[PDB]
Structure 1
Amino acid sequence: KFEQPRHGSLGFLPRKRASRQRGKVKAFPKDDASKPVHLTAFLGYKAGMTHIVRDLDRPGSKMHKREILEAVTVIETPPMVVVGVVGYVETPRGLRSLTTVWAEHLSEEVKRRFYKNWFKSKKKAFTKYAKKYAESTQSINRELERIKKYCSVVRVLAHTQIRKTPLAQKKAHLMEIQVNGGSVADKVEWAREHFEKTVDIKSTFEQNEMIDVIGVTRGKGNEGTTARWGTKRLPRKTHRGLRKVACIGAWHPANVQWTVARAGNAGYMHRTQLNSKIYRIGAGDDAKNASTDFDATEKRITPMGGFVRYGVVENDFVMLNGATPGPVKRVLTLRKSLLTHTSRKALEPVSLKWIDTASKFGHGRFQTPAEAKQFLGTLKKDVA
């Protein structure tokens, strides 16, 4: 009596710690053979958040042709390197990996992924495989041919160039990225040609595209039911504590039910958030990364003082609208959308008017070093 909806979703169970950190693509987009060959996912690094001003183009809206302010998330996306290919055969027990073909040479950062102590090891990871590649170059072609004959699904092995980021970790992140497009033979040919080659973010995604972001959320440790599940605080008078659930079950079933809120792990969980819109695909080689057609000031996408706990973004980046799972510097998986988008909100072209680059280490008031120097004039340190 006095009904209320249950607290939290039974679809996100169990609330254990994720068995991974990277962020796993659970489902790739349906393959269309009529399209050209392309990648369906990319790996980036969460650099930080800022906000933009843009003019809204939404007829029928009170804010049509008016300025809106929006929080955005900046993900640093240097080009990934294709290092291999995996073929999967359709079977009555699911997809099965038939075989995996690697590039002749693998860089050190990807080879660090195969070790817990790369430095102390003998660095013997693909040394015998590499010799096979340069003996006759015939077992490589045979393995690729078998993927063409069998293997309805083809995925490239691609790794990040984490050394180009300011991260202290040297071990690169490696993932299977499904190749969608025309024909299994063309997938394998495309993959072989990209061995040891870079694929960059603008060849995967485009401006205004709607994508999904997959990552592991911020760790929270344990939490009681009040914060883990949102249960009501018990009264001040409650003996033996109030941050709990008063009644965790009836008589009969003489057992605690799985649907009752319990204290436990409250973070570090795997989530795929849908419908993040790409507001900008920045280029790491141009000094007007954060400039607009209305803000001509030559500035890049790094706030004053650098991204807090990240550093300077010197590579390509994406400027998704809103929030993403996980903390600054966690690797995030960007995936092509499984849905079709025809709504006006999804289809509207996005043209930014201004990107904030003030310090996020406080109440920063200057967008650029030059603006700070002009407003304040000269200081005791500036003169000498």
Structure 2
Amino acid sequence: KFEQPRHGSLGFLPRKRASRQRGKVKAFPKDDASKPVHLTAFLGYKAGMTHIVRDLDRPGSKMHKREILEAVTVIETPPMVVVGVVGYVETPRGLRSLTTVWAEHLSEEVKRRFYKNWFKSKKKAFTKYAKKYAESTQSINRELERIKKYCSVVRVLAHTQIRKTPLAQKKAHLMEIQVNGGSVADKVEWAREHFEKTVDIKSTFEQNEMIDVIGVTRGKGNEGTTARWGTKRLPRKTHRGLRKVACIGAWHPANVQWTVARAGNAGYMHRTQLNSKIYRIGAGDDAKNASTDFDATEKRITPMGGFVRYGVVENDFVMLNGATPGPVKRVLTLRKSLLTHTSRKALEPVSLKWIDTASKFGHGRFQTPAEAKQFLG
């Protein structure tokens, strides 16, 4: 008789809570020694989202050279400070971290990440390491020479400057970013020169790039099969209820199959959202970052009244296409896309015409406070 495709994807289970708050990069772009030394991932915070007006330069389309309204996501990306380097050696059992070398000075932001109770502690983290770096710089030199001689993959330890974002959290987020391009010696000397220095997102991404955003989705709590998997609601006559799956299995096998929908956690799950195009890489110091070439109308990216439950974006930000996993103010990972793509949609350059900065809190009718007072008496 009649059949239907399955509800849900068997590739995204178990539908359990993510073991991590911050999106982990499970695959870095394939290393190319011809390319110059560069980073492959940046770590930011979801400020919010808004919408833009854009002229669509897509030949052969029904709305070629005609304005489109497009939703965009704003991720605040203050520069990340490089504080260490880790070397990975390929082995018949996979990658193994041979050694890790840290910078001389680590800020309180990243030192908190090593503590659960930073207020109580004696703040002893990396104190003896800071000493050994002071008197005995030779030991550091042998460690990086070991990385150059043996390790085949070089990853920099870089942390966010969370104090610069309007977040209550004071612990920074520290992650490994693979350094692709050049020889292993080139990566290590690049890491050494960038110790304690800030790497901005302008160098990593170039305003028309397709990236993969990685993060944990917002938790929706425990849900039933109707909402966790999308099954049909049972009829109103149903005794004991209807927001359930009627037949959870057959007589044989005499077990419940893993492929049958059950109630359980639906949310807080690690996702990798592919092919997100950067529409704008705005600078925090620039006062024109929300102004386009056709609009003028000096304005900042933060909507009038502030970003809802985030604050005011004063640092560098990235305006991305579509949506990203996770709620506002969650840490998000922006990695370079693994796949090479030559589609017209993915290759066309993006020119913004107007950016909405009205109040997302409520039905904002005014882009800027100045013209709000002009319309008002």
Counterpart CA distance in 2 for 1:175 and 1:371 is 43
Counterpart CA distance in 1 for 2:343 and 2:328 is 31
Following superposition, the deviation at residue 111 of structure 1 comes to 0.1
Matches within 5 A, 1:47-86: 47-86=47-86
Residue matched to 1:93: 93
Summarize deviations over 1:39-62 as a string: whole Å, max 9, x none. Answer: 000000000010000000000001
Residue matched to 2:32: 32
Counterpart CA distance in 2 for 1:323 and 1:19 is 23
Summarize deviations over 1:122-168 as a string: whole Å, max 9, x none. Answer: 00000000000011310001000000001100000000000000000
Counterpart CA distance in 1 for 2:22 and 2:226 is 29
Counterpart CA distance in 2 for 1:371 and 1:2 is 60
Residue matched to 2:282: 282
Report the secondary structure of 2:371's partner residue: helix
Report the secondary structure of 1:114's partner residue: coil
Counterpart CA distance in 1 for 2:364 and 2:156 is 44
Report the secondary structure of 1:192's partner residue: helix
Counterpart CA distance in 1 for 2:223 and 2:134 is 56
Counterpart CA distance in 2 for 1:36 and 1:254 is 59
Report the secondary structure of 1:149's partner residue: helix
Structure 1: runs of 5+ lacking an equivalent: 378-384
Counterpart CA distance in 2 for 1:363 and 1:273 is 29
Summarize deviations over 1:328-352 as a string: whole Å, max 9, x none. Answer: 0000000000010100000000000
Following superposition, the deviation at residue 30 of structure 1 comes to 0.2
Summarize deviations over 1:222-241 as a string: whole Å, max 9, x none. Answer: 00000000000000000000
Summarize deviations over 1:303-326 as a string: whole Å, max 9, x none. Answer: 011000000000000000100000
Report the secondary structure of 1:372's partner residue: helix
Are residues 1:192 and 2:153 paired? Answer: no
Counterpart CA distance in 2 for 1:363 and 1:198 is 39
Report the secondary structure of 2:177's partner residue: strand
Counterpart CA distance in 2 for 1:327 and 1:208 is 24
Report the secondary structure of 2:124's partner residue: coil
Summarize deviations over 1:352-376 as a string: whole Å, max 9, x none. Answer: 0000000001111000000100001
Counterpart CA distance in 1 for 2:375 and 2:29 is 52
Residue matched to 1:344: 344
Matches within 5 A, 1:225-374: 225-374=225-374
Counterpart CA distance in 2 for 1:72 and 1:341 is 21
Summarize deviations over 1:227-272 as a string: whole Å, max 9, x none. Answer: 0000000000000000000000000100000000000000000000
Counterpart CA distance in 1 for 2:203 and 2:119 is 35
TM-score, reference length from structure 1: 0.98
Residue matched to 2:123: 123
Counterpart CA distance in 1 for 2:359 and 2:221 is 30
C-alpha RMSD of the superposition = 0.4
Residue matched to 1:174: 174
Counterpart CA distance in 1 for 2:286 and 2:267 is 38
Report the secondary structure of 2:12's partner residue: coil
Following superposition, the deviation at residue 187 of structure 1 comes to 0.2
Report the secondary structure of 2:11's partner residue: coil
Counterpart CA distance in 1 for 2:63 and 2:55 is 9
Counterpart CA distance in 2 for 1:153 and 1:89 is 7
Report the secondary structure of 2:358's partner residue: coil
Following superposition, the deviation at residue 74 of structure 1 comes to 0.1
Counterpart CA distance in 2 for 1:108 and 1:17 is 30
Residue matched to 2:201: 201
Following superposition, the deviation at residue 110 of structure 1 comes to 0.2
Following superposition, the deviation at residue 32 of structure 1 comes to 0.2
Report the secondary structure of 1:95's partner residue: strand
Report the secondary structure of 1:169's partner residue: coil
Following superposition, the deviation at residue 210 of structure 1 comes to 0.3
Counterpart CA distance in 2 for 1:284 and 1:341 is 31
Counterpart CA distance in 2 for 1:224 and 1:363 is 33
Counterpart CA distance in 1 for 2:363 and 2:65 is 29
Counterpart CA distance in 2 for 1:334 and 1:153 is 20
Counterpart CA distance in 2 for 1:349 and 1:341 is 14
Counterpart CA distance in 2 for 1:207 and 1:42 is 14
Report the secondary structure of 1:215's partner residue: strand
Counterpart CA distance in 1 for 2:97 and 2:280 is 36
Counterpart CA distance in 2 for 1:43 and 1:136 is 33
Counterpart CA distance in 2 for 1:87 and 1:136 is 21
% identity of equivalent residues: 100
Report the secondary structure of 1:87's partner residue: strand
Runs of 4+ in 1 over 4 A off after TM superposition: none
Report the secondary structure of 1:49's partner residue: strand
TM-score, reference length from structure 2: 1.00
